[PDB]
Amino acid sequence: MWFGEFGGQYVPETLVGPLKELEKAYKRFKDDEEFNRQLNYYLKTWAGRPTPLYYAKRLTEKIGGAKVYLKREDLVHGGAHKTNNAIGQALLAKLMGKTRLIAETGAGQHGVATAMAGALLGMKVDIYMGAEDVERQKMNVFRMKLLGANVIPVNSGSRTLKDAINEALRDWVATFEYTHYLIGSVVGPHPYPTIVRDFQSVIGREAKAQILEAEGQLPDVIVACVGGGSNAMGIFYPFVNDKKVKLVGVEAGGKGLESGKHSASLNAGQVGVSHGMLSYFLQIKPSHSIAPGLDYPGVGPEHAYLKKIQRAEYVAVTDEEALKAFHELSRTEGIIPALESAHAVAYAMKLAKEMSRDEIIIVNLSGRGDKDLDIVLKA
Amino acid sequence: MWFGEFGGQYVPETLVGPLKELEKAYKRFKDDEEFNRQLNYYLKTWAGRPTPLYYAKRLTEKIGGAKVYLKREDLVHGGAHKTNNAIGQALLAKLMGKTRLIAETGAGQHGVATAMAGALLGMKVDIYMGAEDVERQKMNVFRMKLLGANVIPVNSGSRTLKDAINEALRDWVATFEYTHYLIGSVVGPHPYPTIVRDFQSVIGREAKAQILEAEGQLPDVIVACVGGGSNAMGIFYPFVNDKKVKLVGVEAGGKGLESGKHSASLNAGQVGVSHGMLSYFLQDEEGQIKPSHSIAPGLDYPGVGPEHAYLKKIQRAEYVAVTDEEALKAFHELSRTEGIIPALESAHAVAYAMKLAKEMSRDEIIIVNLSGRGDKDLDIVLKA
Ligand code: NA
Ligand code: NA
Ligand code: NA
C-alpha cells in the first residue's frame, strides 16, 4: 500500500473490509489462468490489442533531432488507454460475483470506458458526475447513456469531480456486496493504485518488445502525460528497472504554472490526504486544463514516489503548447491526438530538438482527438 | 475492366491516357515485393491492422439463434475501413512519382481518409466537395483542415457530389503527371473498381483466417452494408470461391423501399452509365438519375459498384435493404449489448444480421462486417 511516503488506505472502518476483500480477490485472480485467459481474450478480440508502435518519420524530420515513436493507445477500442483498466476491473468484479459497477468521472472519459466494459460483461453501470462537468461534456454523457449506463448528476458541493468521488464512496459503503467501485486512474486507497497500474502495464510491455524489434534497443526517453497518472504508469512500469531509460511525466500547465489555472499537482501541489491516499494535491484548490482528462486535482502516489527518488522527471506544458502539438501531429502524421496526449507530444517535440538523431523517444499517445474537435474548433 | 456485363471505362479520351498509365503502374506494383512491404508496414504500424474478429456473445444469446461475429473495421485508424484503400492508393501514387492527391467526397468520410493518408505520406491533398455537402458535414471539413488538406467547395451546378466529381476529373486531366485521383469506393471507370476491391480484400483475408482459428470452419453467412460497395467487396472477395458461404449485401432502405427516399440501387435502381461505369443507379419514371436518401451518410449514394451488379446477376450474393428506423435500433442495440457504438452505415448490416440470426440455429455462424465506429454519428443520433 505504500510507495515510500505516499499511498495508504485512508477510509472509514466500513470500507476496510470491502478493500481487504478486493485485495484478497486481486491477489488470487492476477496470476490465475482462467482470469488471464479471459482478460487477454477481451483485450485482443474486443479492445484490439496489441496497439502498434509507430515511427513518426515526418515529425522526427521536421524537428530535426531524436527519433520520435508513438505508442498508439489512440487505436484501442473507445479511443483511450482507459479501456485496458475498465476491462480488467470489470472482469475482476464479475468473477468476484458483483452485478454492478460504479465510477466517478470529470471528463466523462472514464465514465465511457466503464460504461463500455459494463455493457460488454453484462453489468449494471451507474456513473457519478458533477453537474458542472455534465454541462461541459454533453456528448460523453450521451455516449454513456447509449452504452446503457445511468449517469447520476451530483448536485452537492462544487458539483465537480471532487463531489462525484464523495457520492461514489458513499454509494460503495452501502452497496459493496454486489457493486464494484471502478477507479479510473492510479489513485484512491490501496489496492487501487497498484491494480490500475498493473492493468495498464500491458502498454509498456508491448512498447518494450516493439521498440526492441524496431530499433534493437530501449528508448533514451519515455514521455507520457499525467493526470492521475495511469497511462504514464502503464508505459513507465516495465522500464523502471532499466536504469538508462529516462521517464518524463507531463502535467497540465494550463494558463501557466504561476497563473493559478493548471493541474500540475507534482509541480505545485502540497502533500496531503484525499480520495483515500497520501499524495500531492493542489491547495483544496480546483484545477484547470484545456485537456478534460488532465483536470484531476491530485496525482497517483507511485508518481509522487518516482519523483521523490528521482527515477522520473515531471514537467508541465501549457494549454497553448498542447493546442500547437494537436495541430502539428494532425497535419504532419495524419493522427489527431487527444488533447491530453498532445501535452506529451508538445514536450517530446521540445526534448527531441535538443537530442541527437540516433537517440530515441517513445511518446505514449494515450488517446485520439475526435472527442476534442469542438474544443479545438473554438480555441 | 468488366464484371460480367458491368463496369467498363466510359470516359472521354482525355481520361484514357491517365487511366492507362494508372492501370500499367498498378499491374506492376500490385505483386511487387517493395510496394507490398511498405503497404503492410503502414497498415500495421499506422492503421493498426489486423483488426480483430469479435464474437458478440451477449447479442448472440439475446437473439437466440446463430453465432454473430463482428469483423472490427471500426478499430482501424480513423474509425472506418476507408483507410485501407486511402493508404493503398496514396502509396501507389507516391511510388508512381505523384506528389499530390485529389478526391471527391459527399459525406466527407472518404475526404478524411484521403486527408489522413496524404498527411502520412507527405503529399498535398485537395478535396472537392459540393457546397451543399460542405454545409451538412462541417466537422469532417474541419477534420480535413486539421489533417492539412485543402477542401475546395464546388459552388457551380447543383452544388453536390456530381459537381465535385466533374471538378475532380477536370483537375486530374490537367495534373495527372503529378496528381493521383483517389476514388473512395468500388466505383468509377476501370481500373478503380478492381484497385479499391483489391486494397479492401485484406478485410476478408483476415476474417477468413480469424474465423478458421476461432471456429474451425468458414461462416454460413457474411453480412456487409453496401454504399458504393467497397467494405462489402473487401470482406466478400476472398470467400467468392467458397461456394457454401452465403454473401448478403445490405443497402440503405431509408424511409422505405416504396417511399421514394432510399439508396437501394441494386433492389430498386435500374441499369445506367455514370462516373465512367456501367452499373445500377436510382432512376425516376422519366429515366433520369434521382437523388438517394439514408440516415447513414456513407450509404446516401444513388449508385453501386459494378462487381456487386455482377454478383447479383449470377446470384452469388443476395442484396437486401434495411430502413433508417431498423438501423437506428441496431445502433442502440449493439451499443448497450456489446459496448460497441457502430457507424450508422454498419448498423444496417447489424440490423439485417439480427433478423437473419433469429431464423438460424445456434451452431451456425454469421460474420458482420462492422465497417466503422459511430463517434462521427452521435450528433444526428441525438437529434433523431
Ligand atoms: Na491491433
Ligand atoms: Na493533476
Ligand atoms: Na447505393
Cα–Cα distance, A138 to B123 (Å, whole number): 36
Ligand nearest to the CA of A299: 2
- The answer to whether the beta carbons of residues B280 and B193 sit under 8 Å apart is no
Chain A residue at shortest CA distance from B53 = A45
Dihedrals phi, psi of A126, to nearest 5 degrees: -115, 125
Chain A residue at shortest CA distance from B335 = A147
CA of A269 to the centre of ligand 1 (A): 38
Cα–Cα distance, A125 to B287 (Å, whole number): 54
- Mutation pick from A70, A147, A362, A376 vs chain B, by most beta carbons of B within 10 Å, is A147
Cα–Cα distance, A323 to A10 (Å, whole number): 37
Q: Do A122 and B58 touch (CB under 8 A)?
A: yes
DSSP string, B41-95: HHHHHTT-PSPPEEE-HHHHHHHTSSEEEEEEGGGSTTSBTHHHHHHHHHHHHHH
Residues A325, A331, A337, A343, Cα dihedral to 10°: -10
Dihedrals phi, psi of A184, to nearest 5 degrees: -95, -10
**Using CB atoms and an 8 Å cut-off, which of residues 324-383 of chain B contact chain A?**
332, 335-341, 375-376, 378, 381-382
CA A322 to chain centre: 17
Cα–Cα distance, A47 to A85 (Å, whole number): 11
Ligand nearest to the CA of B348: 3
Residue B75 with chain A: CB contacts under 8 Å? 48, 75, 77
Omega cis (within 30) before B191: yes
Cα–Cα distance, B66 to B21 (Å, whole number): 47
DSSP string, B143-192: HHHHTT-EEEEE-STTSSHHHHHHHHHHHHHHHTTTEEE---SS-SSTTH
Q: Do B338 and A53 touch (CB under 8 A)?
A: no
A119/chain B closest Cα distance in angstroms: 5
CA B263 to chain centre: 14
The grid coordinates listed for B69 are: 461475429
Strands B246-254 and B317-323: parallel
- The answer to whether the beta carbons of residues A203 and A233 sit under 8 Å apart is no
Ligand nearest to the CA of A230: 2
At B127 the three-state DSSP class reads: strand
Own/partner pairs, B40-46, CB within 8 angstroms, 24+ separation: B42/B87, B42/B91, B42/B120, B43/B84, B43/B87, B43/B202, B44/A52, B45/A52, B45/A53, B45/A54, B45/A55, B46/A52, B46/A54, B46/A334, B46/A335, B46/B77, B46/B87, B46/B120
Chains A & B: contacts with CB separation below 8 Å: 106
Q: Do B339 and A115 touch (CB under 8 A)?
A: yes
Q: Where are the alpha helices (DSSP H) in chain B?
A: 13-29, 33-45, 57-63, 82-96, 109-120, 131-136, 138-146, 161-175, 192-215, 230-236, 265-268, 306-313, 324-338, 344-358, 378-383
The grid coordinates listed for A246 are: 529516462
- Residue tagged 489496492 (cell numbers): A191
- Mutation pick from A87, A330, A368 vs chain B, by most beta carbons of B within 10 Å, is A330
How many CB atoms lie under 10 A from the CB of residue B285? 6
Residue A332 with chain B: CB contacts under 8 Å? 119, 148
Helix (H) or strand (E) holding A143: helix A138-146
Which of B53, B116, B139 lies at the smallest CB-CB distance from A334? B116
Dihedrals phi, psi of B281, to nearest 5 degrees: -140, 145
The grid coordinates listed for A273 are: 490526504
Hey, what domains does chain A have and what are their CATH numbers?
Answer: 3-47+83-200 (3.40.50.1100), 48-81+201-379 (3.40.50.1100)
How many CB atoms lie under 10 A from the CB of residue A39? 21
Q: Do B52 and A72 touch (CB under 8 A)?
A: no
